[PDB]
Design a protein around this nucleic acid. Structure first.
Ligand SMILES: [Ca+2]
Ligand SMILES: [Ca+2]
Ligand code: NA
Ligand code: NA
Lengths: 248, 240
DNA sequence: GCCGGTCGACCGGC
DNA sequence: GCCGGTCGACCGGC
């Protein structure tokens, strides 16, 4: 991780920062991006921003198939790329812009190594309902692709929780946490199938004791995933069929 | 519904107005149905304000109809904690956007907003699992003429330094063919559609719709459980 | 403590 | 045309 080395400063800075009032605390992310962008200038990109720079540097390379080749990495291609037509139609006059379903909020990129940062915001005033972290399914395809191409040192996926409470008509950050997906026990991750099949946790609560190799992590995760996937299918009969069979 | 009769009016005013549109819709209705229109939470304030006597949740829940209870109430603690100086507010999780109730009949109205110049990705309509519960309760409690769940679609476009409304539509969940509704299991078990494509045939009885919807739910729940195997198990066993 | 459902609407593969 | 996956958090039942 590129941001750990200065997490303490980020931590300190953000704590205190405020925001207007009507993803309620989403703009807390605009700040993280600003700070990153002030102290890691050359490494910090919004995902679309990253794609935009990528295609601007190779304006001769038009059309999606050829543009996709620019990643040199099927996995990163998978995690960062826009759709075919979207890539087909990209141009300097017609840049990529934000997209709800993009994987990362922020990319930190040095020496062709990638840290995908995602910022989970949170109202500590309100209940403590753990938020969607990332699609379990998307993460599964990610692992598959990691083995298939033997890309185990390409990239990490990390999280920065930013806690806040309401004060008057201003939202103020009271605390923050930071964690690394691939340093957690794969098998302990909670998959909420109904909740868009999303791993769910709070960053402060996430363990980091994992040992093995990145490759061992993918394998282990795929085990977990498949296992929970078999249980969920069965759970469905008990929860969504049995209770309603009688009205029929 | 209390909405359909004046759908000409609604329509007329909406087009040209410049994606928080649930606001505008609401306005017109308040200005025209003063004593029928509530935000789901406003209704709840009122129902609790007009009964200062009874307090606590058990009692308060008695004020609503296990089916309206289920669909509209805010849950034990929130309810127990309600008071004049501590009123309910907007909650993302609420079933309805707008309520319109006359003579103890309820119109749960849901405004679906749609970026008309982007893509036709049908949005979440209502959890198919919540619906299933409802249908079950309607039957168990033999209450088939109490409420409707209608939708008003509101299409919009960024033609300007603002977002403009280009068109609208209106449909009734319970005039739709059940077995036809799409249940997107991963997307929060949500029924997904555009209000404008929603079939409005169905010439059966509210009861029939329910036992038909439930059969659809169950059948679709069975497909999904199988699909999970094919999609999330078979393709990854080779790695484990 | 443990667990998992709900809103909101939004592309893109073939 | 036909399908369905994703991001965003966020509550309440026992
Ligand atoms: Ca985020
Ligand atoms: Ca709505
Ligand atoms: Na994510
Ligand atoms: Na709904």
């Amino acid at each position: 991780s590129f941001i750990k080395p200065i997490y303490q400063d980020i931590n300190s800075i953000l704590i205190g920062q405020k925001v207007k009032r009507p993803a309620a605390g989403e703009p807390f992310e605009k700040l993280v991006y600003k700070f990153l962008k002030e102290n890691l200038s050359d490494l910090t990109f919004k995902q679309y921003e990253y794609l935009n720079d990528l295609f601007m540097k190779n304006p001769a390379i038009i059309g999606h198939e050829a543009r996709y080749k620019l990643f040199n990495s099927p996995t990163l291609l998978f995690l960062l790329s826009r759709g075919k037509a979207a890539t087909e139609n990209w141009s300097i006059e017609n840049l990529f812009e934000e997209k709800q379903n993009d994987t990362a909020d922020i990319l930190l990129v040095k020496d062709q190594f990638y840290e995908l940062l995602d910022v989970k915001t949170r109202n500590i005033s309100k209940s403590a309902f753990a938020p969607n972290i990332i699609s379990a399914y998307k993460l599964a395809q990610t692992c598959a692709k990691m083995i298939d191409n033997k890309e185990f040192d390409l990239f990490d996926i990390n999280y920065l929780e930013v806690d806040w409470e309401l004060n008057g008509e201003d939202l103020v950050c009271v605390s923050t946490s930071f964690a690394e997906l691939f340093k957690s026990e794969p098998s302990e991750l909670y998959i909420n199938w109904a909740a868009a099949m999303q791993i769910q946790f709070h960053v402060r609560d996430l363990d980091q004791g994992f040992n093995g190799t990145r490759e061992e992590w993918a394998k282990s995760y795929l085990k977990h995933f498949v296992t929970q996937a078999e249980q969920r299918a069965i759970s469905m009969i008990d929860k969504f069929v049995k209770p309603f069979k009688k009205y029929i």
